[PDB]
CSV table of C-alpha atoms in Angstrom, one decimal:
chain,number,residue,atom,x,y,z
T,1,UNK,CA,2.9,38.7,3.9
T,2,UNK,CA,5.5,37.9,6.4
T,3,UNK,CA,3.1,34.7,7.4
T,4,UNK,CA,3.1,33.0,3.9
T,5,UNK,CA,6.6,33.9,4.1
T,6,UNK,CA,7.5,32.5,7.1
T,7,UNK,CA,5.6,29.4,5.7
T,8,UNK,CA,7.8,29.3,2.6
T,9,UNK,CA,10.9,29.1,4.5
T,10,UNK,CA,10.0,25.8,6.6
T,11,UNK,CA,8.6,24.2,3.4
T,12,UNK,CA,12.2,24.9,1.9
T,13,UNK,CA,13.3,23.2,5.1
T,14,UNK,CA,10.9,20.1,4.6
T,15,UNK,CA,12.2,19.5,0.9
T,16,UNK,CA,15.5,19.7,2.4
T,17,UNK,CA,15.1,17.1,4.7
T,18,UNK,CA,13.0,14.6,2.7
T,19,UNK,CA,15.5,15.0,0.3
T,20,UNK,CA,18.2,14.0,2.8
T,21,UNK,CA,16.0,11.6,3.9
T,22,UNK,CA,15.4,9.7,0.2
T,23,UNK,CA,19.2,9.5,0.3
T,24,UNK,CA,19.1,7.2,3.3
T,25,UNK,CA,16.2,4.9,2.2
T,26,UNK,CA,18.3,4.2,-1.4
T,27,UNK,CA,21.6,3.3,1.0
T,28,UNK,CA,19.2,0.6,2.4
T,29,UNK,CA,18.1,-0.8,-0.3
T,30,UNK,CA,21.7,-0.4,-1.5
T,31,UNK,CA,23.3,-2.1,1.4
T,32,UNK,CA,20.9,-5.2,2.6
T,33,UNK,CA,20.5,-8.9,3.1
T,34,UNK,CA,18.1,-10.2,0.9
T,35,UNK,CA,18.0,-14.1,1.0
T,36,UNK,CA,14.4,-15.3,1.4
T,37,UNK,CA,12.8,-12.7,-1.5
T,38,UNK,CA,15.7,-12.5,-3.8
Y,1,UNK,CA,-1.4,-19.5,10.1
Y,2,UNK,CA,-0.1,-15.5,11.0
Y,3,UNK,CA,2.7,-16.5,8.6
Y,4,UNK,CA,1.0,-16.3,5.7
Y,5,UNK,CA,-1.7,-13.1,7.1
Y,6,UNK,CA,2.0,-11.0,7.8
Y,7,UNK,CA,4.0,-12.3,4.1
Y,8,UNK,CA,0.1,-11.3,2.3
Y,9,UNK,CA,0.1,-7.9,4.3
Y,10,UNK,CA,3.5,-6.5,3.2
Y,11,UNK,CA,3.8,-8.4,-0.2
Y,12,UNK,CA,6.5,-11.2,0.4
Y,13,UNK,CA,5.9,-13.2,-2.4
Y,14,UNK,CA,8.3,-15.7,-1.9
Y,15,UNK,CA,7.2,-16.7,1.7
Y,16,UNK,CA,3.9,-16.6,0.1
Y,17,UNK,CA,4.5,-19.4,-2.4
Y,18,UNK,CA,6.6,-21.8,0.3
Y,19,UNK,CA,3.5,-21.6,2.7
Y,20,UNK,CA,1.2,-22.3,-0.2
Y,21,UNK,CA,2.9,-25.6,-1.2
Y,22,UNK,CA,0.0,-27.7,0.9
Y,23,UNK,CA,-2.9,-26.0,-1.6
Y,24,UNK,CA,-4.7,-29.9,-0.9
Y,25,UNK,CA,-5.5,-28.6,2.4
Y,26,UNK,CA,-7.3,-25.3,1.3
Y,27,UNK,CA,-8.0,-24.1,5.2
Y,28,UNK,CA,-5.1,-21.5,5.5
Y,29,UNK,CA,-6.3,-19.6,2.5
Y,30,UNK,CA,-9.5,-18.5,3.5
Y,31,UNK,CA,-8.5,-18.7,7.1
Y,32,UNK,CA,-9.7,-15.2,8.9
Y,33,UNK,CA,-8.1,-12.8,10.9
Y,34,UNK,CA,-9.4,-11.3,14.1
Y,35,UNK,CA,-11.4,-8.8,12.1
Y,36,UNK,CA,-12.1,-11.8,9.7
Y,37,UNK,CA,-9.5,-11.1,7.1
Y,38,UNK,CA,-8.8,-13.3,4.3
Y,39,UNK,CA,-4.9,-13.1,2.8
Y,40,UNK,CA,-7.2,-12.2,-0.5
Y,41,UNK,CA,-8.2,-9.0,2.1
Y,42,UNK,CA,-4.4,-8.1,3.7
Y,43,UNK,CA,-2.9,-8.2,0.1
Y,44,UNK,CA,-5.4,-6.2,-1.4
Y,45,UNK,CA,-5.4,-3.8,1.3
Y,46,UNK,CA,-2.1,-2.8,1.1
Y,47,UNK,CA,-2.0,-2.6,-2.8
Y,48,UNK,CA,0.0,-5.7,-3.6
Y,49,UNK,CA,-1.0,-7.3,-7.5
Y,50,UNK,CA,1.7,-10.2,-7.6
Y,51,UNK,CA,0.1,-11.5,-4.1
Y,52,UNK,CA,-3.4,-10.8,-5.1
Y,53,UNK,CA,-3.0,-12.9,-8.2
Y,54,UNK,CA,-0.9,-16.0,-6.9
Y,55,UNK,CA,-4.0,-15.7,-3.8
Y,56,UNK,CA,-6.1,-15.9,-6.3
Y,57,UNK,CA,-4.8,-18.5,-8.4
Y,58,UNK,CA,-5.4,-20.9,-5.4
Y,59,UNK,CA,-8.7,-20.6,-5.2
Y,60,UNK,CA,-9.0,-17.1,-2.7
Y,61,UNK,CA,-12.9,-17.9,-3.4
Y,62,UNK,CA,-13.5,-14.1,-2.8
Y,63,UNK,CA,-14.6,-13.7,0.7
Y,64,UNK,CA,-16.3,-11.2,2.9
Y,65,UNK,CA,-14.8,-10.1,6.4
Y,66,UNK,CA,-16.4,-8.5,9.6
Y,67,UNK,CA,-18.1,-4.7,8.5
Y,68,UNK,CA,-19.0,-6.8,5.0
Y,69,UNK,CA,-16.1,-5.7,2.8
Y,70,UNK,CA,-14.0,-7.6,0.2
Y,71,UNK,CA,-10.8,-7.6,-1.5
Y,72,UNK,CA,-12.3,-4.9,-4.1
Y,73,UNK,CA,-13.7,-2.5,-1.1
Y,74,UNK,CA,-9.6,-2.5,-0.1
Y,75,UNK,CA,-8.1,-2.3,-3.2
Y,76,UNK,CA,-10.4,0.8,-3.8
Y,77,UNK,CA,-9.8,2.2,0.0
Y,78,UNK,CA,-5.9,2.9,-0.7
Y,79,UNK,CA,-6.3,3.6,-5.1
Y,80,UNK,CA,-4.5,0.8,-5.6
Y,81,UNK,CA,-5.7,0.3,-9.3
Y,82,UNK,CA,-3.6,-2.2,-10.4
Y,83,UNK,CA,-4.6,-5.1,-7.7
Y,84,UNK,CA,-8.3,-3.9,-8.7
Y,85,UNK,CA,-7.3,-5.0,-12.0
Y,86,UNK,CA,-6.8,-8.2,-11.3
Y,87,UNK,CA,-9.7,-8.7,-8.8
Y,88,UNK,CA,-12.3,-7.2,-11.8
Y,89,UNK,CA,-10.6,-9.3,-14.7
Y,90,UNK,CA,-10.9,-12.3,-12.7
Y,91,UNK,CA,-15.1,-12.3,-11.8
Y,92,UNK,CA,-17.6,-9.9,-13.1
Y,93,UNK,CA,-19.2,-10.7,-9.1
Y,94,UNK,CA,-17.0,-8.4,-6.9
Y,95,UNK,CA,-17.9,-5.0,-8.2
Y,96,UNK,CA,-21.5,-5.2,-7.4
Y,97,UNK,CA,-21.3,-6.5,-3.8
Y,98,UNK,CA,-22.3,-4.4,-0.7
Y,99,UNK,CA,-20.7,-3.9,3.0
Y,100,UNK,CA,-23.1,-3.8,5.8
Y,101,UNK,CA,-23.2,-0.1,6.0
Y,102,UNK,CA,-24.7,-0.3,1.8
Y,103,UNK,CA,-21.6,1.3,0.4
Y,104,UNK,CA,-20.0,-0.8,-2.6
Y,105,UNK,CA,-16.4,-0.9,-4.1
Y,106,UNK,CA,-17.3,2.7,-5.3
Y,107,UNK,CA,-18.3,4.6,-2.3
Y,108,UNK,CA,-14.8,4.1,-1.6
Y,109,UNK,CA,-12.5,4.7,-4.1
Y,110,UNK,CA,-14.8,8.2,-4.5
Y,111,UNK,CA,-14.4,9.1,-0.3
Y,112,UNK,CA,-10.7,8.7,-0.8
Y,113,UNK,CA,-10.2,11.0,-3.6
Y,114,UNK,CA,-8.9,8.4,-6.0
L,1,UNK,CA,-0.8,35.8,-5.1
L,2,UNK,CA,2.1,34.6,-7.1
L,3,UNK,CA,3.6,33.9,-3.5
L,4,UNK,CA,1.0,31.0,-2.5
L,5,UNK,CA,1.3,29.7,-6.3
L,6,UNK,CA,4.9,29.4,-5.6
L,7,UNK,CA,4.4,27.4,-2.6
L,8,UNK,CA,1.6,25.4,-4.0
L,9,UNK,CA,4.3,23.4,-7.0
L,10,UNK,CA,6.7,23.2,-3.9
L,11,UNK,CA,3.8,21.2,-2.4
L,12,UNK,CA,3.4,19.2,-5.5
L,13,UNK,CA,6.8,18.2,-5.8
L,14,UNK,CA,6.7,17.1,-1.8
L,15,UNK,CA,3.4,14.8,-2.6
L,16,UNK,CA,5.5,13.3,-5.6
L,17,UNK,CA,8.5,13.2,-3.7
L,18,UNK,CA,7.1,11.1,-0.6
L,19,UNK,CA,4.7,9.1,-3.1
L,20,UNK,CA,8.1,7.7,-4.5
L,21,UNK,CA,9.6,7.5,-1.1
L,22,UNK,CA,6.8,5.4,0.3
L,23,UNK,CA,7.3,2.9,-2.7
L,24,UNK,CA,10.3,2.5,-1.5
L,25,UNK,CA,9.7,1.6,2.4
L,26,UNK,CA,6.7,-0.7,1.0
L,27,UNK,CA,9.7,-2.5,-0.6
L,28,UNK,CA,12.3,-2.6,1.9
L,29,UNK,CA,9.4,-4.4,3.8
L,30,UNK,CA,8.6,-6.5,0.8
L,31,UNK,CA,12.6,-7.7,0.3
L,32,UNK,CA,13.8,-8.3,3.7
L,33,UNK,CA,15.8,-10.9,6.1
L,34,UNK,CA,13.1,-11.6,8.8
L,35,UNK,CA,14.5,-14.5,11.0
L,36,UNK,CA,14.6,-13.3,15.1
L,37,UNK,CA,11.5,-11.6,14.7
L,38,UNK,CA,9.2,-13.7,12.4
């Protein structure tokens, strides 16, 4: 019990920093040069 | 040459289209890789439809590289199902073909889980 | 029981979550200013 548990708090740390992550890869797209593929 | 095997790997359409302006000279597009990839293989691959379709377009003439697979034993590596609709709407030929080690475009799309 | 059911939809939502990420990345590569390094 206090393995699955210990296993549900660094999953609720890996949505957490995937989410943070996502954030980043939309500012890219956000902010970019596109010339040649526009 | 590795141009137009990097803009077909990674979908750039556009660089795609400017290297295929000399389509009298059909070398580059069935030109192969070190492993014998065709453009038709690297776009396919990867899961790329808009490359896949202008490739083939051109005259891609469906290849085979080095282990014996084709465009349709990538697209079905990866589940891309939407380049393996335009590589099975274009010839009835693909779907039956083999690699070397007897698997078709099914073994793989099953292995995968797709 | 209802504690590995719990972490199996946190799963699916971080399969769904990267599947949409990865779009993403396969896009910033597909739209991109490539001129010192082509």
């Amino acid at each position: 019990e206090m393995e699955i548990l210990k296993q549900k708090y660094r999953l609720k740390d890996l949505t957490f920093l995937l989410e943070k992550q996502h954030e980043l890869i939309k500012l890219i797209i956000q902010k970019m040069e596109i010339i040649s593929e526009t | 040459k590795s141009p137009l095997h990097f803009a077909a790997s990674y979908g750039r359409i556009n660089t795609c289209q400017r290297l295929l302006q000399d389509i009298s000279d059909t070398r580059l597009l069935n030109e192969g890789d070190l492993h014998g990839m065709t453009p038709l293989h690297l776009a396919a691959k990867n899961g790329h439809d808009k490359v896949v379709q202008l490739l083939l377009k051109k005259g891609a003439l469906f290849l085979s590289d080095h282990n014996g697979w084709t465009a349709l034993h990538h697209a079905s590596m990866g589940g891309y199902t939407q380049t393996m609709k335009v590589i099975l709407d274009t010839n009835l030929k693909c779907t039956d073909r083999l690699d070397e080690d007897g698997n078709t475009a099914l073994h793989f799309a099953a292995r995968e889980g797709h």
